[PDB]
Amino acid sequence: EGNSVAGIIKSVNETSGANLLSSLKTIKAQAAPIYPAAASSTGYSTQAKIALFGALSWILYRADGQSKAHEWIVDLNLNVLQAAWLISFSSLIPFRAVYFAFRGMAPATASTLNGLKTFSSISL
């Protein structure tokens, strides 16, 4: 669409002097960016259904292959040994510190975006 600043300039120039100060909250609301409101909550997507159906299919196929193996009970308790460390990772990992440490790996999120200053772009 057309840009919002030209809409500000046009609709501010179109107001009368008496109409100006109360129209300013409307004009601002017509120049505010679209932030889409929360739409319909569907169930799971067809790719999410495909993902979890294929994951459960893979887990059942792998458990059936593990049970038919020679040291089958050894494999079935290896699954317990690995799920135990998954459960302990859920408990031990400081996920907020991990998130903010990953934010420091990228330079785009390690710093605030420093660019255009206000004093150079002042219009009058």
Binding site: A106, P107, A108, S111, L113, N114, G115, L116, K117, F119, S120, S121, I122, S123, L124
Partner: protein
């Protein structure tokens, strides 16, 4: 214990196909996104001084 596969070439080709897909997905899907997000910040950080000085010179408002 399993040591030797049924086919060495099939398993090496599986490794090649997986690593070639990871290479394509890195070069094509991940690196353009990463470079857009990185280089916007990097170009603004590298150009803040010269950009603000040039815009300060071009501005007749003062």
């Amino acid at each position: 214990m399993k040591l030797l596969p049924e086919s060495l070439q099939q398993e090496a080709a599986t490794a090649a196909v997986v690593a070639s897909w990871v290479l394509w997905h890195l070069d094509t899907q991940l690196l353009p996104t990463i470079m857009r997000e990185h280089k916007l910040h990097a170009c603004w950080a590298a150009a803040a001084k010269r950009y603000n000085e040039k815009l300060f010179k071009l501005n007749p408002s003062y």
